[PDB]
Amino acid sequence: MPSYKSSRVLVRDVPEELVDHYERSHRVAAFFMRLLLAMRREPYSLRMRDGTEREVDLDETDDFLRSAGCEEPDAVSDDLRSFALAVLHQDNPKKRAFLKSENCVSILCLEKSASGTRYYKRPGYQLLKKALKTDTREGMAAALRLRERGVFPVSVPEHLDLDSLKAAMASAAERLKSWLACNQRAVDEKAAVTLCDADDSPIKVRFGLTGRGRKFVLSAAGSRFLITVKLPCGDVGLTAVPSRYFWNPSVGRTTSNSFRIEFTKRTTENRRYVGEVKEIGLVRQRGRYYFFIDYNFDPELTVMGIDLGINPAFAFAVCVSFDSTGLRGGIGSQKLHREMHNLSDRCFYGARYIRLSKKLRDRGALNDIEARLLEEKYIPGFRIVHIEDADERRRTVGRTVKEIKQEYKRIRHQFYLRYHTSKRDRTELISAEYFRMLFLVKNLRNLLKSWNRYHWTTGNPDELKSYVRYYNNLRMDTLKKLTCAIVRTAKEHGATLVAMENSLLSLWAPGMVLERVEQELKNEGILAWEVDVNAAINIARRFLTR
RNA sequence: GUGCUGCUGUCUCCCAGACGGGAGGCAGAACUGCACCUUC
DNA sequence: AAGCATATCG
DNA sequence: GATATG
């Protein structure tokens, strides 16, 4: 029902108290994850930082449960599982024992807890006020039965206040529920957990106003946020570095436990935005502390047909007669695009010439099709001089890969200079060179992957991950800018309805491009639906017939 | 603030095997442009 | 899988 | 304000 947007703000001088709170929250969250997994008393698998998976048997979980304060698990097993499935939301939603998973911590950890006795929020009590013995869910009944057995108030490894425990339990339950859904999807084929860590896999340490986590206050001074976190040990004050997503912020404490923030998103438009902040998430990434600010926001005949081409970024028609037509995102630099295509082809053919060379080295020519495929296309596409011997051929391939790498670096630098060569004005918002670079890097990653595995016969996870990062980031940026261009063209033309259908399918699944454009068009207030310039005209006409 | 996103100098690890490739850490110069919902 | 609300007694 | 449960 609600709508969210998000951004991170970096904080530099984090006091020791906040770092200790962060680390303790991560440790207790890992403890809760392991405890909930142990309560199911079923064998599972966990993957560590090295990437290999270990399988934990039932005996280790039994030992952990006995360490956590339950001296006789096998005699109370049916209760524990009955509790755990309630926490992970594996019961009927109508009779949910814990609507939010944090609610169990009072039963889990508190000594003098009175949970499970109060009934003021029961609808029957409300109706009697206006004028439970069987109503109790199995999840709460099992928890009470465990508590009265002297078993359930487990020993938390590190002492924390109730609110921080609730936040840690919330994060742990979220991760475990996601893993459990994945495990169900895997078992239904006819699945490994990942314990949270302070640096290798952080959880969002949450601060909230209603009671989940410690309370927080945020204000704005000039162009930066000032955040005060109300830890039990004091009140830590922080100042975030200015962010161009929140360039000129100004906040107001609302009367409904929320902070209204008004900011300016630095773009060409510099449009003002308003949002509501209610929870804040501290996270550590490579030694730097970022607060995830997730803010709610309020979303806002002329029709268009949109065609998502590859050589043009898109073609639009507006309108019966189409008095407005055009293309957006054409080729900007002819020679750059041509060189990009040539290098992509070179890498594509080299990836196969490597395998053919290995086969020749270890077995010799096998059949006519291998030799002909090498001679007609692999030799000139990877243009290179053939060598009969093994090591000389390997050295020639090495020289060819060096040349390819140098050309790739030059092409990347030229593409980067599109925003800094005093010709920024000529540069368009979107162009086909983005997709061409994506294809080029996808082919080049494969080429280097084949090259690195030359030594072994035909027969670490850090390999080439910089290229993976670049590919993913460039693809995300391309999608963002394409969506921006589409919505900008829609809004400038005053359209109210949009109709829309080595290719796009190889870069994205059929869904997320359409879903992203649909969501962004709806957010601005423009409706859209699924059914060159002629294709866009045809799409618009097809929508018009309906 | 995350990216688009690079260049130069320098340093440390890994795969080879004297042809090359891979992952990062610092120090500079240049430009200050274009978009941004994120975690699992 | 998520990025809160509301009641009650003190 | 501190629990507690929608």
Side-chain angles (χ1 to χ4, degrees), chain A residues 376-424:
Chain A
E376 316 290 8
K377 25 195 282 194
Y378 295 160
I379 287 284
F382 197 41
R383 64 200 95 82
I384 204 183
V385 280
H386 209 112
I387 300 189
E388 302 291 348
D389 210 353
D391 63 277
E392 295 93 326
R393 182 170 64 255
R394 193 189 66 231
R395 283 192 284 282
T396 306
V397 171
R399 284 212 309 276
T400 307
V401 175
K402 191 186 74 177
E403 293 186 3
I404 282 171
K405 185 77 176 298
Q406 272 182 19
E407 176 77 343
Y408 166 80
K409 283 175 62 178
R410 185 189 69 81
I411 275 179
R412 182 179 61 191
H413 188 61
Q414 284 299 328
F415 188 48
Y416 148 84
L417 278 178
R418 78 190 181 285
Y419 285 123
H420 303 285
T421 185
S422 308
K423 297 182 66 69
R424 317 174 191 86

Side-chain angles (χ1 to χ4, degrees), chain A residues 455-489:
Chain A
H455 60 83
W456 56 10
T457 65
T458 70
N460 72 83
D462 295 304
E463 177 181 33
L464 295 160
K465 89 170 176 316
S466 70
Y467 290 90
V468 183
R469 276 209 309 279
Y470 181 38
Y471 175 75
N472 286 329
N473 294 342
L474 179 56
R475 182 168 52 153
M476 185 192 293
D477 202 67
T478 302
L479 179 59
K480 286 173 175 176
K481 280 170 176 160
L482 172 59
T483 303
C484 180
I486 284 171
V487 303
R488 190 164 297 189
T489 42

Side-chain angles (χ1 to χ4, degrees), chain A residues 171-390:
Chain A
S171 306
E174 291 190 59
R175 272 185 171 233
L176 276 186
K177 281 184 281 178
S178 81
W179 163 80
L180 199 44
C182 182
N183 185 15
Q184 203 54 0
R185 261 161 200 202
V187 168
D188 283 332
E189 287 270 37
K190 306 307 297 180
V193 309
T194 310
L195 282 310
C196 55
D197 201 359
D199 299 276
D200 313 329
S201 189
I203 54 146
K204 192 185 294 180
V205 175
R206 304 220 285 271
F207 300 97
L209 292 161
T210 184
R212 176 199 289 169
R214 302 301 297 188
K215 285 87 179 181
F216 74 97
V217 177
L218 75 88
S219 60
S223 51
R224 70 211 301 166
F225 283 121
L226 313 177
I227 303 179
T228 83
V229 174
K230 304 193 70 79
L231 298 183
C233 94
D235 200 333
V236 286
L238 307 166
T239 166
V241 283
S243 169
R244 300 179 77 94
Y245 191 100
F246 302 109
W247 176 238
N248 277 311
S250 57
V251 310
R253 176 60 179 270
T254 62
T255 59
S256 58
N257 293 320
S258 66
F259 285 98
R260 263 190 78 263
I261 64 170
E262 174 177 359
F263 59 93
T264 304
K265 192 192 298 180
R266 289 301 304 273
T267 46
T268 314
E269 290 196 351
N270 291 301
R271 207 204 306 177
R272 267 292 207 198
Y273 290 99
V274 297
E276 284 229 345
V277 177
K278 294 185 294 198
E279 283 199 16
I280 285 292
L282 177 57
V283 167
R284 183 161 75 203
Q285 290 195 339
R286 59 172 87 81
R288 292 141 73 95
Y289 290 94
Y290 296 90
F291 280 109
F292 284 82
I293 301 191
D294 310 307
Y295 68 92
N296 290 116
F297 78 107
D298 193 10
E300 177 68 287
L301 77 179
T302 43
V303 79
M304 273 212 301
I306 300 292
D307 179 30
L308 303 184
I310 177 57
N311 193 324
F314 65 96
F316 71 94
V318 200
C319 85
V320 294
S321 182
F322 303 100
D323 249 346
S324 284
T325 49
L327 294 48
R328 296 292 179 101
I331 294 168
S333 180
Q334 293 302 349
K335 79 192 312 298
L336 184 64
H337 186 273
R338 183 60 168 165
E339 290 155 39
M340 269 188 209
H341 195 90
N342 295 355
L343 192 66
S344 75
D345 290 339
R346 279 192 77 182
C347 294
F348 177 89
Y349 291 127
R352 294 166 166 71
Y353 184 86
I354 289 282
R355 189 195 308 274
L356 279 207
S357 184
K358 278 199 293 181
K359 188 185 290 180
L360 157 63
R361 182 199 69 199
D362 295 341
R363 275 91 172 276
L366 289 186
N367 45 44
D368 178 60
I369 66 167
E370 168 215 316
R372 77 189 318 291
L373 271 193
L374 169 134
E375 188 74 328
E376 316 290 8
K377 25 195 282 194
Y378 295 160
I379 287 284
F382 197 41
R383 64 200 95 82
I384 204 183
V385 280
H386 209 112
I387 300 189
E388 302 291 348
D389 210 353

Side-chain angles (χ1 to χ4, degrees), chain A residues 340 415 418-419 427-439 474 477-478 481 507:
Chain A
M340 269 188 209
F415 188 48
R418 78 190 181 285
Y419 285 123
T427 291
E428 269 211 353
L429 175 47
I430 187 62
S431 60
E433 289 137 46
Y434 288 84
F435 312 109
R436 199 79 268 157
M437 252 307 287
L438 283 172
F439 293 131
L474 179 56
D477 202 67
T478 302
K481 280 170 176 160
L507 296 182

